[PDB]
Amino acid sequence: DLKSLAKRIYEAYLKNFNMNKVKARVILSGNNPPFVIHDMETLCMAEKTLVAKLVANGIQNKEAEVRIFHCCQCTSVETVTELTEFAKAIPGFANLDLNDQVTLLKYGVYEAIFAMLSSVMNKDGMLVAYGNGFITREFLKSLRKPFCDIMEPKFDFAMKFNALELDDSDISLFVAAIICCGDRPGLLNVGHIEKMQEGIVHVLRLHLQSNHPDDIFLFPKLLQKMADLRQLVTEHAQLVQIIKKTESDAALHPLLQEIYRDMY
């Protein structure tokens, strides 16, 4: 039954996420090729084509860094929606109390976002805007503080994560495992969540044994990556709070304020 479960999870991931690692790699290899954003000129050209409304305000347009952060947030909002539908495929998740489902998604979504973001990153940049842009790592590093500090730690995570050479069948189960954590704050039915976690981690362990016979440590490596992601998210939330206190024009999306509320 466990092999079928792993396949169910994988198929739900292919159905629910607009981006997957095969799709990303086709684009990254070289109709509607990605526009390269490597400097301010190319950022502004890409915006006029791909997010026209955001730059249709004349002198009232926000600063480039703020527009970029707004696009970051919109991407995360969309991935939250995808993750919420994906979670229905996880055995036991839809049987939990609605409040526990909310709590698991609240604490898990950014860990999952940063894990999956690795699939659209290479050492030089990342896919954005539904695969229609490629923004360079160096351009993001060139932004004014604090905005240049957003992406670089995610690239650092992603380069090591990508060196594990996971595929979509592994990543789908890793994301399911992130969502099923019994130690999130405020859970009502910890015991049932712990059982759900044990089941999905068992599926993950057996799948990695079968799909990666060459890497006998891969399961504990991925357990460590989950802990690393929790630290990456805590640090990300600290930076977002700096932006919220010091950058008045950088409006925080109403759906993401709730995810951050009483996190770190």
Ligand X SMILES: CCCCCCCCCCCCCCCC(=O)O
Q: Which is nearer to ligand X, 109 or 181 (CB)?
A: 109
Q: Is 119 in the site for ligand X (CB under 6 A)?
A: no
- Integer Cα distance of 108 and 86 in angstroms: 13
Burial class (CB in 10 A: 0-12, 13-18, 19+), 262: exposed
Cβ–Cβ < 8 Å for 174, 166: yes
| 3-state SS assignment for residue 97 | coil
Write out the binding residues for ligand X, residues 229-258 only, by CB under 6 A: 240
Least distance (Å) between residue 55 CB and ligand X: 9
Q: Which is nearer to ligand X, 6 or 128 (CB)?
A: 128
13 annotated ligand-binding residue: no
Q: Contacts with ligand X: how many residues (CB under 6 A)?
A: 16
Which of 23, 38, 63, 73 is close enough to bind ligand X by CB under 6 A?
Answer: 73
Least distance (Å) between residue 20 CB and ligand X: 16
For ligand X, what does the binding mask look like between residues 29 and 48, x meaning CB under 6 A? -----------------xx-
Q: Is 133 in the site for ligand X (CB under 6 A)?
A: yes
Write out the binding residues for ligand X, residues 165-184 only, by CB under 6 A: none
- Integer Cα distance of 169 and 176 in angstroms: 11
| 3-state SS assignment for residue 250 | coil
Instruction: Report residue 35 CA to chain centroid gap.
Output: 22
118 annotated ligand-binding residue: no
Q: Is 128 in the site for ligand X (CB under 6 A)?
A: yes
Q: Which is nearer to ligand X, 75 or 84 (CB)?
A: 75
| 3-state SS assignment for residue 128 | strand
Which of 28, 135, 171, 200 is close enough to bind ligand X by CB under 6 A?
Answer: 135
Q: Which stretch binds ligand X (CB under 6 A): 68-76, 91-99, 207-215, 226-234?
A: 68-76
Least distance (Å) between residue 243 CB and ligand X: 9
Alpha helix positions (H), the chain: 2-16, 21-29, 40-50, 64-86, 98-117, 137-142, 152-163, 168-179, 190-211, 218-246, 254-260
Longest dimension (CA), the chain: 60
Locus of tokens 């996420």: 17
**Which positions make up the binding site for indeglitazar?**
76, 110, 260
Residues found near ligand X in the complex (CB under 6 A): 46-47, 50-51, 68, 71-73, 75-76, 117, 128-129, 133, 135, 240
